[PDB]
Amino acid sequence: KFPRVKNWELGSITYDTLCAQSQQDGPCTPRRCLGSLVLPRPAEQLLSQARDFINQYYSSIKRSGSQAHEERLQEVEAEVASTGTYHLRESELVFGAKQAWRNAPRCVGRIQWGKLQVFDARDCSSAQEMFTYICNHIKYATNRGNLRSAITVFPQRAPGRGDFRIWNSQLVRYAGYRQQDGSVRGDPANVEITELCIQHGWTPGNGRFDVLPLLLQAPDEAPELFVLPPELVLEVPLEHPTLEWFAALGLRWYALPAVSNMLLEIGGLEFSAAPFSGWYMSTEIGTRNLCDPHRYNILEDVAVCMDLDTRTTSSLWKDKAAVEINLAVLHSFQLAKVTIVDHHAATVSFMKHLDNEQKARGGCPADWAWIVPPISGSLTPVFHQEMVNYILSPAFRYQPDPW
Amino acid sequence: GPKFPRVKNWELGSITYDTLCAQSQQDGPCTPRRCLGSLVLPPAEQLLSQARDFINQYYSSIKRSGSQAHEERLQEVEAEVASTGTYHLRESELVFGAKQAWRNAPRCVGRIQWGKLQVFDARDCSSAQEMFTYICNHIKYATNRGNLRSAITVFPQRAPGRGDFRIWNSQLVRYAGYRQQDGSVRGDPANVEITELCIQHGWTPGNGRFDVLPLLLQAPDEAPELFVLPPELVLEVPLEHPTLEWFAALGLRWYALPAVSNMLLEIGGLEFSAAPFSGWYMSTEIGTRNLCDPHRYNILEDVAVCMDLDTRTTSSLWKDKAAVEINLAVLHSFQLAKVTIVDHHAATVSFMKHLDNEQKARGGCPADWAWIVPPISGSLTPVFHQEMVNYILSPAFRYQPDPW
Ligand code: HEM
Ligand code: HEM
Ligand SMILES: N=C(Nc1cccc(COC[C@@H](CN)OCc2cccc(/N=C(/N)c3cccs3)c2)c1)c1cccs1
Ligand SMILES: N=C(Nc1cccc(COC[C@@H](CN)OCc2cccc(/N=C(\N)c3cccs3)c2)c1)c1cccs1
Numbered sequence: 093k094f095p096r097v098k099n100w101e102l103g104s105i106t107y108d109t110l111c112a113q114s115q116q117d118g119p120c121t122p123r124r125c126l127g128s129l130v131l132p133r134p135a136e137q138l139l140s141q142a143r144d145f146i147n148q149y150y151s152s153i154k155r156s157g158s159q160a161h162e163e164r165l166q167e168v169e170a171e172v173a174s175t176g177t178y179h180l181r182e183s184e185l186v187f188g189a190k191q192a193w194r195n196a197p198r199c200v201g202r203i204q205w206g207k208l209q210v211f212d213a214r215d216c217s218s219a220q221e222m223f224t225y226i227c228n229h230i231k232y233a234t235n236r237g238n239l240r241s242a243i244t245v246f247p248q249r250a251p252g253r254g255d256f257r258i259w260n261s262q263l264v265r266y267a268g269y270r271q272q273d274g275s276v277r278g279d280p281a282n283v284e285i286t287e288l289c290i291q292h293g294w295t296p297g298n299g300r301f302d303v304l305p306l307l308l309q310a311p312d313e314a315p316e317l318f319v320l321p322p323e324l325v326l327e328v329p330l331e332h333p334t335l336e337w338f339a340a341l342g343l344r345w346y347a348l349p350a351v352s353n354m355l356l357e358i359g360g361l362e363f364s365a366a367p368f369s370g371w372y373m374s375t376e377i378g379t380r381n382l383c384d385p386h387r388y389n390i391l392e393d394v395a396v397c398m399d400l401d402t403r404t405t406s407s408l409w410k411d412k413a414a415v416e417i418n419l420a421v422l423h424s425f426q427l428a429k430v431t432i433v434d435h436h437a438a439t440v441s442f443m444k445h446l447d448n449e450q451k452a453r454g455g456c457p458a459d460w461a462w463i464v465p466p467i468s469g470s471l472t473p474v475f476h477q478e479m480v481n482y483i484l485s486p487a488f489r490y491q492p493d494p495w
Numbered sequence: 496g497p498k499f500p501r502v503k504n505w506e507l508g509s510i511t512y513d514t515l516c517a518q519s520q521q522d523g524p525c526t527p528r529r530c531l532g533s534l535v536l537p538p539a540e541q542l543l544s545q546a547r548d549f550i551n552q553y554y555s556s557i558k559r560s561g562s563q564a565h566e567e568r569l570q571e572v573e574a575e576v577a578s579t580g581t582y583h584l585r586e587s588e589l590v591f592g593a594k595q596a597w598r599n600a601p602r603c604v605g606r607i608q609w610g611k612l613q614v615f616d617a618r619d620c621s622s623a624q625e626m627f628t629y630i631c632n633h634i635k636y637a638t639n640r641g642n643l644r645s646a647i648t649v650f651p652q653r654a655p656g657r658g659d660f661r662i663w664n665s666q667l668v669r670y671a672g673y674r675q676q677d678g679s680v681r682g683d684p685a686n687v688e689i690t691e692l693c694i695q696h697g698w699t700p701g702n703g704r705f706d707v708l709p710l711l712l713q714a715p716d717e718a719p720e721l722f723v724l725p726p727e728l729v730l731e732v733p734l735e736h737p738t739l740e741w742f743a744a745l746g747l748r749w750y751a752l753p754a755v756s757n758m759l760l761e762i763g764g765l766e767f768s769a770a771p772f773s774g775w776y777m778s779t780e781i782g783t784r785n786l787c788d789p790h791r792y793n794i795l796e797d798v799a800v801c802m803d804l805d806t807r808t809t810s811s812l813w814k815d816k817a818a819v820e821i822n823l824a825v826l827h828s829f830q831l832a833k834v835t836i837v838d839h840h841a842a843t844v845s846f847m848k849h850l851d852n853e854q855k856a857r858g859g860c861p862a863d864w865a866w867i868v869p870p871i872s873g874s875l876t877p878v879f880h881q882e883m884v885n886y887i888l889s890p891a892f893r894y895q896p897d898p899w
């Protein structure tokens with residue numbers, strides 16, 4: 093039985109046959125669905141993942157069964173049999189990184205998947221060198237506000253030694269300073285990394301939007317601290333198109349979302365440090381980062397400024413303030429000429445993506461809870477779209493924190 | 496760690512383990528290879544085991560497990576099944592089972608109320624005319640002039656050979672949907688099929704946007720019969736907005752009583768094919784889904800234009816702004832009319848309370864995250880941040896094929 097996938101707004105039906113290509117189990121069983129959980133609840137092994145990936149590559153370039161194909165499978169085989177591991181060619185790495193993005197079920201931005209700048213940093217041997225590559229990535233991806241998706245791939249995990257890691261969860265994160273009275277100044281999501289930085293010798297600030305240094309770690313060495321040059325970190329002050337007091341809130345966000353703690357897996361090889369970046373969808377900032385109760389939690393402040401009745405849920409004060417805050421983000425990014433996409437445009441392009449992928453591959457792995465935006469869910473076409481979630485490789489995965 | 500699903504709340508940092516899912520006797524649609532959680536619609540000795548399990552649940556709930564009363568009931572059920580192929584529930588077992596089915600429903604955000612359900616036992620009903628009388632009484636009781644009371648009416652169970660009692664309509668109150676010459680719809684497009692069935696069965700159709708449908712009621716082995724709800728039994732709320740004075744001019748309205756009539760209530764393997772139940776609305780059901788879905792009344796653009804918003808560009812957030820005011824209008828109008836309604840913030844807070852209660856009572860709670868999270872303002876509600884485990888327990892409300 094292959095899944096029947098229905099769109100409830102349009103009445104149309106497709107069948108996902110791509111899910112038969114999945115080789116890794118998810119969290120669900122017949123007895124119970126664990127779909128809403130955030131985190132996951134030998135040589136022959138490597139060799140079959142490696143061959144499968146080599147097959148994916150030669151098929152993508154329309155050279156399946158070529159002499160080039162047969163000989164590359166022999167190289168991979170020879171190298172695994174002798175050494176227990178193998179190495180990718182740059183062109184395979186490029187193909188693999190794009191496929192890992194294509195395959196990411198939680199990503200609404202996958203219409204863009206073919207357009208990814210891949211920096212090969214596999215010749216990196218020190219934390220100092222990782223920093224140089226990271227600075228070049230930021231400069232390239234930022235591009236004065238005309239954002240360009242990029243990934244930098246540092247050296248693969250190797251059976252002997254420690255991993256290359258970027259300890260920070262993103263390349264740009266704001267500090268979170270825990271008070272003696274438990275409360276937090278700045279971003280509560282970043283309390284632990286903030287403390288790690290101070291402990292490794294960073295002189296901390298005391299503002300709401302202090303940009304953290306990077307803790308970069310080469311194998312089996314303590315991490316090293318590197319402050320990002322302020323000119324490399326583009327930020328956008330937040331103002332509202334009609335509410336004058338909104339700028340008085342002193343709010344800002346950074347332009348460049350760059351995730352730096354996920355493991356990249358290609359053909360059985362694992363890249364423990366492979367930071368990737370694109371551009372933001374406005375609800376990430378406007379709704380989650382600014383309005384989550386465990387984040388900057390600004391809903392009440394904005395509601396009061398708007399003079400809303402805060403004493404009762406049924407005035408929909410939270411909803412009204414969230415909308416204005418999202419509007420402010422979109423407005424302020426647009427005024428700063430910094431790439432951003434609203435949740436309506438983003439979900440519409442994802443629907444087009446689902447259709448491209450249906451034709452190209454016979455399905456598309458998608459995690460409904462992550463694709464539907466955190467405000468105005470049913471106002472976007474993705475709410476009414478059934479989705480099938482499953483794990484294809486190449487993949488981005490979670491990995492343990494290195495401390 | 497415990498060998499049970501670990502469930503995390505990301506707002507609070509707290510962890511529970513669901514041990515109740517161990518009581519699931521019935522598979523869902525997911526496998527290790529793929530998750531199908533977002534899909535909307537994904538006996539002889541078999542009866543006896545379902546029956547025994549249910550009787551065991553009953554005697555547990557009254558604290559007499561392994562008692563002599565418990566063992567005699569088991570024997571009596573097997574005897575009844577032995578000689579008749581079926582069995583029948585005691586009044587108090589029916590009441591316990593109907594509440595349990597509600598308690599068990601993974602898609603219901605209103606379950607904090609599960610213990611407060613008026614169970615009307617209509618297992619003596621023998622005609623479509625009598626079903627109608629029972630339904631009118633249900634509506635009068637549940638509506639209670641706007642102070643809504645949860646209720647279920649239970650018609651006779653499916654019986655070997657004999658045809659089912661069925662209510663053909665999906666709810667007791669539905670507005671007509673009339674297919675137009677140009678291909679668009681007047682009224683509620685959700686109800687085009689039931690509207691045309693009403694016409695095929697002799698109803699004289701109106702032509703407004705909010706025409707209440709007649710009921711199509713079917714007693715065993717008979718053609719359904721058509722019944723018009725007396726207008727004064729169907730409480731409606733005209734919609735106005737607290738500050739936008741033109742909103743009243745739109746002539747929008749919704750009915751007070753949501754009463755689902757096409758689900759099958761399954762208890763101990765017995766099947767109640769006609770068992771309409773009612774509670775009250777969460778405001779987003781009306782203001783977001785019913786009024787704003789593109790395939791429903793689809794009023795977003797009309798409202799946005801009245802608000803003078805920029806409908807030519809997604810990034811004005813015109814849809815979001817209009818939807819908020821429409822939801823506000825629903826809340827304000829039900830409040831002014833003194834008709835029970837619950838907003839999506841208050842409903843989700845109470846559901847978080849429900850989760851805590853069930854963790855202590857039963858060691859978990861089956862919940863369908865996609866359905867529990869409201870359709871506007873998702874992450875503004877505490878349920879967004881709460882992991883949930885979905886599984887099927889019995890007694891259960893289930894979908895059943897349409898009678899036609
Ligand atoms: C080009 C613009 C892009 C947009 C607008 C975008 C949008 C998003 C959004 C909104 C999320 C959910 C994030 C959250 O809730 O915290 C996400 C998830 C993700 N996207 Fe993207 N995406 C983009 C490009 C990329 C790129 C370049 C990659 C990698 C090459 C990527 C890989 C991912 C992955 C792996 C996830 C899931 C992370 C997780 O499971 O925790 N996306 N995407
Ligand atoms: C007391 C007030 C109640 C509220 C506010 C409420 C709220 C809701 C809401 C919003 C839904 C989702 C409906 C949709 O999106 O179409 C739902 C689903 C459901 N509720 Fe309730 N509920 C209430 C009482 C009841 C009662 C009395 C029963 C039955 C005894 C019930 C059983 C159900 C079932 C079976 C579903 C799932 C329908 C399906 O799977 O298709 N609830 N509830
Ligand atoms: N507040 C309430 N809301 C509520 C509770 C439960 C159900 C409902 C409304 O029914 C939900 C229904 C309608 N969208 O969703 C499930 C469903 C069931 C059956 C058919 C559906 N759609 C179709 N048209 C089909 C496609 C293929 C076969 S049928 C969809 C509303 C209450 C009602 C009763 C007590 S509380
Ligand atoms: N627009 C973008 N946004 C984006 C894309 C992907 C990811 C992200 C941000 O990461 C999401 C993260 C952070 N909330 O959520 C999931 C997560 C991942 C890993 C660990 C998590 N939890 C923990 N670290 C734990 C704490 C205590 C025990 S475990 C939680 C943002 C882009 C980023 C890069 C290209 S596009």
Ligand SMILES: C[C@H](O)[C@H](O)[C@H]1CNc2nc(N)[nH]c(=O)c2N1
Nearest residue numbers: 128129130461462879880881882
């Ligand atoms: C419990 C729940 O799965 C969790 O809050 C998820 C829901 N959907 C999400 N969707 C996105 N895009 N990002 C998230 O962090 C989450 N969090």
Ligand SMILES: C[C@H](O)[C@H](O)[C@H]1CNc2nc(N)[nH]c(=O)c2N1
Nearest residue numbers: 475476477478533534535865866
């Ligand atoms: C495809 C998707 O499952 C579908 O649109 C669901 C999503 N969540 C829902 N949630 C509720 N409460 N009611 C619904 O009808 C739906 N529809």
Ligand SMILES: [Zn+2]
Nearest residue numbers: 120125525530
């Ligand atoms: Zn699942």
